[PDB]
Design an enzyme around this catalytic site. Structure first.
Site, PDB file in Angstrom:
ATOM      1  N   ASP A 119      -6.489   8.110  -0.533  1.00 13.67           N
ATOM      2  CA  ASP A 119      -6.074   7.160   0.466  1.00 13.67           C
ATOM      3  C   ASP A 119      -4.918   7.808   1.229  1.00 13.67           C
ATOM      4  O   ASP A 119      -3.957   8.330   0.631  1.00 13.67           O
ATOM      5  CB  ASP A 119      -5.574   5.872  -0.199  1.00 13.67           C
ATOM      6  CG  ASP A 119      -6.687   4.993  -0.689  1.00 13.67           C
ATOM      7  OD1 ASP A 119      -7.848   5.283  -0.369  1.00 13.67           O
ATOM      8  OD2 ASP A 119      -6.414   3.999  -1.386  1.00 13.67           O
TER       9      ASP A 119
ATOM     10  N   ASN B  93      -7.469   6.929  -5.272  1.00 14.69           N
ATOM     11  CA  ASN B  93      -7.853   5.550  -5.517  1.00 14.69           C
ATOM     12  C   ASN B  93      -9.114   5.521  -6.347  1.00 14.69           C
ATOM     13  O   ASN B  93     -10.193   5.802  -5.854  1.00 14.69           O
ATOM     14  CB  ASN B  93      -8.064   4.781  -4.224  1.00 14.69           C
ATOM     15  CG  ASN B  93      -8.444   3.319  -4.464  1.00 14.69           C
ATOM     16  OD1 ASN B  93      -8.856   2.922  -5.572  1.00 14.69           O
ATOM     17  ND2 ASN B  93      -8.328   2.513  -3.416  1.00 14.69           N
TER      18      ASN B  93
ATOM     19  N   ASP C  55     -11.876   3.625  -4.866  1.00 13.49           N
ATOM     20  CA  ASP C  55     -12.466   4.336  -3.746  1.00 13.49           C
ATOM     21  C   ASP C  55     -13.134   5.664  -4.111  1.00 13.49           C
ATOM     22  O   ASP C  55     -13.891   6.198  -3.301  1.00 13.49           O
ATOM     23  CB  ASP C  55     -11.378   4.685  -2.710  1.00 13.49           C
ATOM     24  CG  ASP C  55     -10.841   3.479  -1.929  1.00 13.49           C
ATOM     25  OD1 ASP C  55     -11.283   2.331  -2.128  1.00 13.49           O
ATOM     26  OD2 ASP C  55      -9.957   3.696  -1.074  1.00 13.49           O
TER      27      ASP C  55
ATOM     28  N   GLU D  67       0.813  -1.212   0.000  1.00 17.44           N
ATOM     29  CA  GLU D  67       0.000   0.000   0.000  1.00 17.44           C
ATOM     30  C   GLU D  67       0.840   1.252   0.000  1.00 17.44           C
ATOM     31  O   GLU D  67       0.589   2.187  -0.770  1.00 17.44           O
ATOM     32  CB  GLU D  67      -0.966   0.060   1.197  1.00 17.44           C
ATOM     33  CG  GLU D  67      -2.064  -0.978   1.191  1.00 17.44           C
ATOM     34  CD  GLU D  67      -3.217  -0.662   0.230  1.00 17.44           C
ATOM     35  OE1 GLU D  67      -3.140   0.316  -0.521  1.00 17.44           O
ATOM     36  OE2 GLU D  67      -4.214  -1.402   0.224  1.00 17.44           O
TER      37      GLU D  67
END
Length: 130
Positions: free
Chosen positions: A53, A46, A49, A35
């Site tokens: 992030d 992201n 998302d 990550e």
């Protein structure tokens, strides 16, 4: 701040991550490596998302932290997104613990499913004496 591997392993063990929700320290280490490369200052947009992030664990501002004093933030971790970019990772660990407590668990991180699940996480805690 960028952690050396064994340094991070010890810090997460000190913070009660090993065996949390049945996720071994090795798995947390594998997650953090892919990550963010152990860098607390990492940030990425992201696509999945549809948000940014934050940090070591790449936690999203869509549901977990409030970015920029938004009155309308879900902020499940009740923390400012900036606190997840600090050198002291206690806040990021507290918030990641919260993420895995929801129905998806460790799978909430696509990177975990993609780079760690059903594979050699053992090498990440190697020689650390953790």
């Amino acid at each position: 701040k960028v952690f050396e591997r064994c340094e991070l392993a010890r810090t997460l063990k000190r913070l009660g991550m090993d065996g949390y929700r049945g996720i071994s320290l090795a798995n947390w280490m594998c997650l953090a490596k892919w990550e963010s490369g152990y860098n607390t200052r990492a940030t990425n947009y992201n696509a999945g998302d549809r948000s940014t992030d934050y940090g070591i664990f790449q936690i999203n501002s869509r549901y977990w932290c409030n970015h920029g004093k938004t009155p309308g933030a879900v902020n499940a971790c009740h923390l400012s997104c900036s606190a997840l970019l600090q050198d002291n990772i206690a806040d990021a660990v507290a918030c990641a613990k919260r993420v895995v407590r929801d129905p998806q668990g460790i799978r909430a991180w696509v990177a975990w499913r993609n780079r760690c699940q059903n594979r050699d996480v053992r090498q990440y805690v190697q020689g650390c004496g953790v």
